[PDB]
Amino acid sequence: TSMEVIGVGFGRTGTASLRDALNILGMGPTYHTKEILRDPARLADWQAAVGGADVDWDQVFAGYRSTVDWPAAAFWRELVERYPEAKVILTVRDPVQWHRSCMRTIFMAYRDRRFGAFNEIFDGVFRRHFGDGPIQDEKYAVEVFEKHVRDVQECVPAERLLVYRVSEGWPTLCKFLGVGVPIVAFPHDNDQDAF
Numbered sequence: 001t002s003m004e005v006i007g008v009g010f011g012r013t014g015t016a017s018l019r020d021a022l023n024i025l026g027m028g029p030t031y032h033t034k035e036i037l038r039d040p041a042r043l044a045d046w047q048a049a050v051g052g053a054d055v056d057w058d059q060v061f062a063g064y065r066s067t068v069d070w071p072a073a074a075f076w077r078e079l080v081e082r083y084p085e086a087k088v089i090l091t092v093r094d095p096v097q098w099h100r101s102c103m104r105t106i107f108m109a110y111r112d113r114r115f116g117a118f119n120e121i122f123d124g125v126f127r128r129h130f131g132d133g134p135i136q137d138e139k140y141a142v143e144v145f146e147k148h149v150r151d152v153q154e155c156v157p158a159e160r161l162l163v164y165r166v167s168e169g170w171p172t173l174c175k176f177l178g179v180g181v182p183i184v185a186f187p188h189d190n191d192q193d194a195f
């Protein structure tokens, strides 16, 4: 299928831990914003995609077998259609807790030089969900978060979708993917030192 797992949850829903877990389970290498922080030239792919280019997703994800997090979650419909055999994982969270975490981290802007273009490109990524509305407004952002959960559940067949909280750890994830439960601890990446 080329793609094993497409994570379509928003950032700050445990996506770094899910990345690590998919990697442990042999479903990786797993794309994540971390890959763009390691190689900022990858920003060009997402800048093109946000701008309406006919993206070659096999080139965007060359070298990777799964993806989680933004930016790819802002293209979730495209990717579910492009990779119909991939399993889809929607990570969820209390949406109020989610937004409060975002305001301290990835949405801080809404109140090295290799990342000069990062904020403008990711503004385009986020606004594929938020539109021109107020990202910083908790009531609005909760509505966007809840709409996305409904949209995913209405679009992806239930047998191909896992609605997942990372606090569940291995058992539900591994049952969904059809693999055994690892001995190693389930990841708990707080995803804080990038800030």
Ligand SMILES: Nc1ncnc2c1ncn2[C@@H]1O[C@H](COP(=O)(O)O)[C@@H](OP(=O)(O)O)[C@H]1O
Pocket (backbone or CB within 6 Å): 010, 011, 012, 013, 014, 015, 016, 017, 101, 102, 166, 167, 186, 187, 188, 189, 190, 191
């Ligand atoms: N195994 C786990 N159990 C519970 N929460 C977890 C977890 N792994 C990660 N998280 C939480 O998921 C959030 C990070 O999500 P992401 O990797 O998408 O940025 C962090 O919470 P906070 O957002 O409250 O700090 C982190 O503590």
